[PDB]
Design a protein around this nucleic acid. Sequence first.
DNA 1: GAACATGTCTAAGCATGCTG
DNA 2: GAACATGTCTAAGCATGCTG
Lengths: 188, 188, 188, 188
Amino acid sequence: SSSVPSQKTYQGSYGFRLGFLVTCTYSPALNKMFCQLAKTCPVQLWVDSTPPPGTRVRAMAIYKQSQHMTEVVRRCPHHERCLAPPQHLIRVEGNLRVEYLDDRNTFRHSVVVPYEPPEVGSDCTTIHYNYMCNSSCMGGMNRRPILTIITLEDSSGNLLGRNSFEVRVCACPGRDRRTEEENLRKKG
Amino acid sequence: SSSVPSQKTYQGSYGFRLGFLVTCTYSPALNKMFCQLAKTCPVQLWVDSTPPPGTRVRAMAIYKQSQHMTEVVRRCPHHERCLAPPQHLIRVEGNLRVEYLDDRNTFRHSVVVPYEPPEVGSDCTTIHYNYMCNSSCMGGMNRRPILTIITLEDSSGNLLGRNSFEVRVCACPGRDRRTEEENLRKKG
Amino acid sequence: SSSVPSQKTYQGSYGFRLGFLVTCTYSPALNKMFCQLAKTCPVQLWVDSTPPPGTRVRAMAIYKQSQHMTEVVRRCPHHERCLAPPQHLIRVEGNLRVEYLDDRNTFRHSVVVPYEPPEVGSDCTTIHYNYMCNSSCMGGMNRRPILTIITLEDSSGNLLGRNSFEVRVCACPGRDRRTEEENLRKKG
Amino acid sequence: SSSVPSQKTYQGSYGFRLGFLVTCTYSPALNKMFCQLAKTCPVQLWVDSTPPPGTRVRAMAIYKQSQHMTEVVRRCPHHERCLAPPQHLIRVEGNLRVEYLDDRNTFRHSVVVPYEPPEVGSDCTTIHYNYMCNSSCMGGMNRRPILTIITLEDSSGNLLGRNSFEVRVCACPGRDRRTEEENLRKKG
DNA sequence: GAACATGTCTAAGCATGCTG
DNA sequence: GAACATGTCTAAGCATGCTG
Ligand SMILES: [Zn+2]
Ligand SMILES: [Zn+2]
Ligand SMILES: [Zn+2]
Ligand SMILES: [Zn+2]
């Protein structure tokens, strides 16, 4: 069986979609977050129908390039050495029921929190993600772009929905977003 | 009985076809993959009808030239010395059920994984292959072109489908593809 | 007592001097070696008078900048993780009597080999040093320039001579030497 | 103690010198032999005074470049796999008292034969060396130039004389000698 | 926020065993 | 013996965290 997780969008029967509200800036044209290391990066969860009780929200990173897709995305040794295991790239802050998973078969890391419906009178649910390395970190991502895959799962483990977005963790998110959007217009 | 495996295309009752999505680049005119050694090279499996449970996907290399077709394709001694047995040229990455076979009668190497139907909502299945020598490696392929033969087999061992593509593992796939396509146009 | 080792040149009663013979290139104007990581970098030992039997040759790195001089120079965690202890920056190759020292009081690293007089008919002695991080390595030298201090010591531990040279370990030694010499001429 | 053998010319008290008499061609300007793999390459031994009984003649290869000098020169794995141990690069043919040595401390290979004075009426002594890899062999010399060091040693192990010459083992010695001599004249 | 930093990428040219 | 082969080298430009 594949040890490479699917990245294909599956908005499913619940109409699952992500939203994004500088330390952080999202490019719709590129479907790509640009953010700074270890600074919280809010992601909104939107649904058309209410998921069942016990639904979970999982995040996982994979390398976007075909030559790297089968390699597990990990924290670099420098940032490892200085609740979350130090090897995990993606953390969730501000949640009392975070679980960190090291898959015993695929060795992939993921971080999971319960799905909480918006409060009476609210429109969406926000999760506070944190990326603990730069995209450029030697011995970690090493300048290789990643995707973050967000899956909505029921308590039985059924996939209910899947979305993903590219991430660049970098020192200058505004600069680098402008550069990439301009490159797209001129050479893409 | 022959110890030379058939290379003839047999797209069979399931409508079995290969797809190909630079470290690697595929030439449709040549039906030939150009890729770099030890860098993963994705191959898509397409079918018109769903194969039975237990279907397997086998890959095997053979020399394309008639003067070399009866010689087993193997890893060169240099790359052998530095799950897959070190003598095998072709590996599969990213799969938890890979099997490597050394045929006890023909001495041919092959690598097999279970056929997995595309996920609900997907269109095809990708296998992450890896070639561990350059076509030029002394004491291995020694500049001899190979074909990779992909067979779809049921659990009983019946051939269900067969496809093949030429491979050149080289340092400069883009350069070498351009050269060979130009040579085809001018002198083929 | 100080835990910062002296860097002051002491060419002493034996007339101790260093010589330097691209993966490496020495700038006399800057008294600075430019070299690549993990590539051997020969240093010549010259003396006017023959040192006693049992003389030893020690190498130690220290940060050149006053704000960093009291911090021990160490290998970065990435290059540590992939005879010499993995925390040591400076190795000696090609010698059967190397000793690596972690000072129990100062925590400084050094590497020592016996002094061998030139062979009958020779003029100097070469030691094959190796620097296992770039000056830029995150979590190690972190772009801070270092000096290497070479001391000639008798077996009793008396200082006989001392010399030092700046080091920049970098990807492009020729480029970076040209840049720094030009900057000296224009802005120094 | 150094595990790097000296290459410095020492023609010594016996006036020891080498002579060289296409599969083989010697460049005096470059002090460099150009020869083909596994084809015998005669080297003449000249002396002014007769060495004592029991004198031996040793040959050893080292890498010429400073970045490679501390690495032992070995046969590549391909030519290893197809009296001399298969790991040795340099063989002596036509001698009944050849000894092959793997140094237990330095791991360096060498090949030794007795020194035989020229026959009554002769002028020099010829040894038939054979290089069993090309300079270009992957996993062996890998395009790195070598020197061959020839030492005259007494039976007690005293060094009596030392000479050396660069070697390029290649498919086209005449071509490559012409190219290198021209490069010397134009760009050296 | 503009400029500097510095390991990496890229394309043209070099390499060197092999082919015709 | 001249031309082709094909992994490698080289220099200019790109990269991206850091400095001023
Ligand atoms: Zn990091
Ligand atoms: Zn190989
Ligand atoms: Zn480092
Ligand atoms: Zn060889």
